[PDB]
Design a protein around this ligand. Structure first.
Ligand SMILES: C[S@+](CC[C@H](N)C(=O)[O-])C[C@H]1O[C@@H](n2cnc3c(N)ncnc32)[C@H](O)[C@@H]1O
Ligand SMILES: C[S@+](CC[C@H](N)C(=O)[O-])C[C@H]1O[C@@H](n2cnc3c(N)ncnc32)[C@H](O)[C@@H]1O
Ligand SMILES: C[S@@+](CC[C@H](N)C(=O)[O-])C[C@H]1O[C@@H](n2cnc3c(N)ncnc32)[C@H](O)[C@@H]1O
Lengths: 313, 312, 313
């Protein structure tokens, strides 16, 4: 029961809604899902073919064994930490990739992650369009920014970006992507801090942003050990986000992975957060479709994450 | 069963005893307990009113919910958590003063705010012991934490050795030293397992006039040494005795996590001090609620055990 | 079940086998096992008499209580971090030792381990002989090298040594031993890396070694958090080791403290790994025999570890 992190009461009427909205990613170029099944997925990231666990890929693989057995890297093991197997000669920590004009690194760590969630291109497209068509310089806030591809998309489009992540290591990775992308001179502020602390302090300062993106994990830790738990804390976070939106704000975008909840729960939370603000809240799932070996052969849907987006419409 | 951490054999009579002794504080300073109940407590720390869990505060709160809700900071979660700041975001630290010593309250990911204000009773004993001493005194403060006792002793003119296994905690204590204006005071900062340090002091023939020790139920030395109060305390107290000066003024043991009785601490202390004369006083250290006005005595909240040997 | 870490299929005949081979050390010079029983052991390491837990010492102690009660240090256990008791007086962190001509430090940490496995002298003797009777300087690889006494034995004998350990702290200890042993100028290359990642990279580089020693724990962690689990990963490890043996290799030596397995399981793994390579695989247990107080007095066997050794013999 939420005692201390409740959203504040707002006046006015709930915004309009579009729900469910299923967003489906196209590859993308350097990424496609080749095949999946038996609790695994087979993905192409540029020159690297990778096998990773995907528990919900319950069905049987449709692409021949020979294609799976030609993978460059296979993630194995059971905390979250495991071991990559490299069955041929592909090796080192990193490899270059590009999505939506932004060059960044795929990276093998002890975790199953590869340094990008390429399905998020659908949201980066929304972001890029919003920045490049705005007739004024925009401020974009990116919370839980990870390897920073959204930050770089926004920076490349002309935004003044503030990227927030509690992990100094992840900030380092994002900065490496910034160099690779040729965006060293772009206005990106790198904030290594707990995300909710940063925004509450921004609220106290009276700071505002035109677009806020937020990608909270189910569980996290702030830079000074502050426990983050999505189901305990999200209502306060979104409330503070609204308090730091500019009068002419273009959007508030929430993405959520790996969570025992429907998009309807993100949706109704977002609708209530934005009570009296007008506009429209669109929510649902973000999915990838299998594309086969050639990348042109549509197959099954693999749902990755939830989203809810407010816009002034 | 304790096989390897037994105290040495002693001769003579057990010291005199005063037991139970209940030591009480009510916060006539930058601290008081406002209210408690339903497994929580409402406290004033200087400019901030804070709400923290207190599982043994089983009774019902006497101050209206509206007041608790109005707190500046609430500690939440299941040991790490998250502080909620309902009015507006608060900075990490805020200045406090107790017994003439200025130090920092601190919001960390834990429930601890950087001070145990009830310990002012033991600080007052210490302050008096040092002040009224004819001679310069050597004070050892084991498991010293944020070091308010170290600063009290330094301010009274003692030569202080502060021992804590945590470099982070030493850092906080040093920050307090600076804020308190005690940078030129003789405080030696030792980052080491406490029992290792005192056994090495014994080997060196070092002595101290006053020893305070605040061991946790479980801890870890600077180099991973496992500390467990019920396995190791008998040996620690025995070594403490071995490093007391001939004219020592006291040995003070404080113990949180109040599962064992003060009687156990008491019988162990008394036996450790066999043949040393003086008196062992033991019991609990408690805070009494003071209400919104700080002047309305309420319920007792017991925080810790203590046992103190003095030549008294 | 092993899906991703199988050794390649080999053709040809399994090497000859000698099994069980029980290797026994009675402790010379600075080490011997005085007595053991009641789940404890009483050992002399140079000038210190030490008591440590030894759960399999189920029998009774045969040396009087007085002698045990005169110990300089006793390890007392939460299980495996604990606390050393020094009953006579506080002991410093380290003390000088020497075995097989190599000077190194005994060390009190929060674990039961004193900085050397002196029973390993039997394998060090095999190694010393192999290096010092060779007609060329041998390349010796030592995986999971710990405090590096084997590395120092090989280097003293004239080998070019590569020492691999994921722990920077352990590498630091080994280097301290190198200094103490007077081997600072010797060709020892200190590698702080996951052992399997290092050897796969060696394989890619086409590198070879004349002798390979590997002492994998049941469970470990690479420098960059890679999970090591002997039962999941050892088959691939040994196969890569084979691929980095020189044509004129003198041996591949596996040691394992995972006592629960039989030496037969290390044996058959090593035999199959070396299929078609000729030579001989000898496997069994490495044991210490109690030496008692005075005279060299043969007592009970304390088995410490498993081993399997391939040689071209
Ligand atoms: C942890 S999530 C990982 C990706 C995706 N959102 C998911 O849940 O799988 C994205 C980023 O959030 C960061 N993070 C976790 N807790 C945080 C916190 N309390 N404040 C700021 N960033 C945090 C992580 O360091 C990471 O780079
Ligand atoms: C951990 S206790 C916490 C306060 C109070 N004594 C309690 O138990 O709740 C006080 C200090 O003991 C220190 N400490 C814990 N184990 C220690 C050890 N083995 N040696 C020296 N200091 C230790 C901690 O770093 C901390 O600052
Ligand atoms: C095997 S462990 C301890 C000694 C003995 N083998 C045992 O299991 O009890 C020996 C060394 O392996 C190292 N180690 C553990 N995991 C490793 C890894 N993944 N790669 C390289 N070294 C590792 C440790 O740092 C340690 O110094």
């Amino acid at each position: 029961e939420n005692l201390y992190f409740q959203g504040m009461q707002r006046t006015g009427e709930l915004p309009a809604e579009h729900v469910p909205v299923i967003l489906e990613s196209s590859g993308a170029g350097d990424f496609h899902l080749i095949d999946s099944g038996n609790g695994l997925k087979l993905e192409q990231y540029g020159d690297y073919r990778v096998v990773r666990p995907e528990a919900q890929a319950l069905w049987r693989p449709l692409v021949p064994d020979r294609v799976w057995q030609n993978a460059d890297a296979i993630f194995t093991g059971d905390d979250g930490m495991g071991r990559w197997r490299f069955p041929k000669e592909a090796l080192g920590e990193t490899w270059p990739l590009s999505l939506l004009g932004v060059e960044f690194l795929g990276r093998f760590t002890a975790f199953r992650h590869v340094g990008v969630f390429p399905e998020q291109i659908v949201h980066w497209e929304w972001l890029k369009n919003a920045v490049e068509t705005a007739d004024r310089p925009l401020k974009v806030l990116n919370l839980f920014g990870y390897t920073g591809v959204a930050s770089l998309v926004a920076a490349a489009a002309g935004a003044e970006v503030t990227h927030v992540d509690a992990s100094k290591k992840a900030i380092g990775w994002a900065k490496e992507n910034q160099v690779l992308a040729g965006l060293e001179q772009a206005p990106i502020r790198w904030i290594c801090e707990d995300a909710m602390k940063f925004i509450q302090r921004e609220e106290r300062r009276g700071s505002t942003y035109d677009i806020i993106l937020t990608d909270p994990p189910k569980f996290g830790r702030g830079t000074h050990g502050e426990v983050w738990q999505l189901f305990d804390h999200l209502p306060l976070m979104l409330d503070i986000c609204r308090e730091i939106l500019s009068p002419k704000a273009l959007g508030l975008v929430l993405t959520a992975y790996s969570i025992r909840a429907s998009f309807y729960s993100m949706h109704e939370l977002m609708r209530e957060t934005m009570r009296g603000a007008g506009g429209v809240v669109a929510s649902g799932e973000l999915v990838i479709r299998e594309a086969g070996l050639d990348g042109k052969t549509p197959g099954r849907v693999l749902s990755t994450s939830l989203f809810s987006r407010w816009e002034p419409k």
